[PDB]
Design a protein around this motif. Structure first.
Motif, short mmCIF file in Angstrom:
data_model
loop_
_atom_site.label_atom_id
_atom_site.label_comp_id
_atom_site.label_asym_id
_atom_site.label_seq_id
_atom_site.Cartn_x
_atom_site.Cartn_y
_atom_site.Cartn_z
N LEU B 135 -27.97 34.58 23.55
CA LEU B 135 -26.80 34.48 24.39
C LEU B 135 -27.19 34.25 25.86
N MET B 136 -28.27 34.88 26.35
CA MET B 136 -28.65 34.65 27.74
C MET B 136 -29.11 33.21 27.98
N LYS B 137 -29.83 32.62 27.01
CA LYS B 137 -30.23 31.22 27.15
C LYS B 137 -29.00 30.31 27.08
N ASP B 138 -27.99 30.68 26.25
CA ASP B 138 -26.79 29.86 26.17
C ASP B 138 -25.99 29.91 27.48
N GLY B 139 -25.96 31.07 28.11
CA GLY B 139 -25.26 31.28 29.38
C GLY B 139 -26.01 30.71 30.61
N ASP B 140 -27.30 31.07 30.82
CA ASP B 140 -27.95 30.67 32.07
C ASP B 140 -28.49 29.25 32.09
N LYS B 141 -27.63 28.36 32.57
CA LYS B 141 -27.89 26.94 32.60
C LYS B 141 -28.92 26.47 33.65
N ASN B 142 -29.25 27.32 34.62
CA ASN B 142 -30.19 26.93 35.69
C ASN B 142 -31.55 27.58 35.52
N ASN B 143 -31.75 28.25 34.39
CA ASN B 143 -33.01 28.94 34.08
C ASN B 143 -33.55 29.96 35.09
N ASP B 144 -32.67 30.81 35.65
CA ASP B 144 -33.08 31.88 36.56
C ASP B 144 -33.28 33.15 35.73
N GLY B 145 -32.58 33.22 34.58
CA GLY B 145 -32.59 34.36 33.68
C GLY B 145 -31.35 35.23 33.84
N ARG B 146 -30.34 34.70 34.52
CA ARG B 146 -29.10 35.44 34.79
C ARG B 146 -27.88 34.55 34.69
N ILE B 147 -26.73 35.13 34.43
CA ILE B 147 -25.51 34.35 34.40
C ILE B 147 -24.68 34.53 35.67
N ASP B 148 -24.44 33.45 36.40
CA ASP B 148 -23.63 33.56 37.61
C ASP B 148 -22.18 33.42 37.21
N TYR B 149 -21.30 33.49 38.17
CA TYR B 149 -19.88 33.36 37.96
C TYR B 149 -19.50 32.01 37.30
N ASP B 150 -20.05 30.89 37.78
CA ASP B 150 -19.68 29.57 37.25
C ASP B 150 -20.26 29.43 35.84
N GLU B 151 -21.47 29.97 35.61
CA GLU B 151 -22.04 29.92 34.27
C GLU B 151 -21.23 30.77 33.31
#
Lengths: 55, 160, 55
Positions: B135-151
């Protein structure tokens, strides 16, 4: 009468197949023309890529 | 994809059996047993619709998972659930904004892996390491390892 | 004989049109895939043009 009905069904089929092949042919021509246009664009952009790479 | 794949998992066997009968109509006479734009166009016209070749190619591309350029039965079931909605409207951004704040326990503005793990365990479902990592790889589109608001908004798009 | 010959001429025509239908349909899917590929190669080179252009 039965062969004529046979014919009506297969004539209607020929008509459906004829219309569909014309449709598919026209669509093929266009898909192909799109492909050709896209290939022309490829070449327009490929030569312009060279111009752009040169630029 | 995920919301539609879940809906497919939940289809009953009889519902799948009826969809298979429909699939068989679409692929009758096809060389590879699959639906190409020629079979899809013949059925859509039989149904009274007049899609362009581009619309037909897009309908296939939307569910094509292998890159075959064709639709197999599994891909067909996704096409059939995508064509219908139980999950109409699908909420909106303001509601997701308030939910985002609940995932963001440290109030930093991002959902990190520990926050995601806490929220997943809270659901009561067995959570495997693979559920968390995927789920984290599906969410974090910029590869920081976190999900931001837009993600987060893309991550939960269409989720009822 | 005319309705049967007709049926056979039509079956022959229907078959020619059916084959042309399927030939054009299969080839349409391919022409579409060439358009997708033609547009795809266009995009790869056009994108390079954009990337090179961006650079």
């Amino acid at each position: 009468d039965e062969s004529e009905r046979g014919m009506k069904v297969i004539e209607s089929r020929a008509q459906k197949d004829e219309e569909k092949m014309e449709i598919q042919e026209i669509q093929l021509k266009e898909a192909k023309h799109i492909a050709e246009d896209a290939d022309r664009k490829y070449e327009e952009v490929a030569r312009k890529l060279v111009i752009i790479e040169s630029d | 994809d995920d919301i539609y794949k879940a809906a497919v998992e939940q289809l009953t066997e009889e519902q799948k059996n009826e969809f298979k009968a429909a699939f068989d109509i679409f692929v009758l006479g096809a060389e590879d047993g699959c639906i190409s734009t020629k079979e899809l166009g013949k059925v859509m016209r039989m149904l009274g619709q007049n899609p362009t070749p581009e619309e037909l190619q897009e309908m296939i591309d939307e569910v094509d998972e292998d890159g075959s350029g064709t639709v197999d039965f599994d891909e067909f079931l996704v096409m059939m659930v995508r064509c219908m909605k139980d999950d109409s409207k699908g909420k909106s951004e303001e509601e997701l904004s308030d939910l985002f704040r609940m995932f963001d326990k440290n109030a930093d503005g991002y959902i990190d892996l520990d926050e995601l793990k806490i929220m997943l365990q809270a659901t009561g479902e067995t959570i495997t390491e693979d559920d968390i990592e995927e789920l984290m790889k599906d969410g974090d589109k910029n590869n920081d390892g976190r999900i931001d608001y837009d993600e987060f908004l893309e991550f939960m798009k269409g989720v009822e």
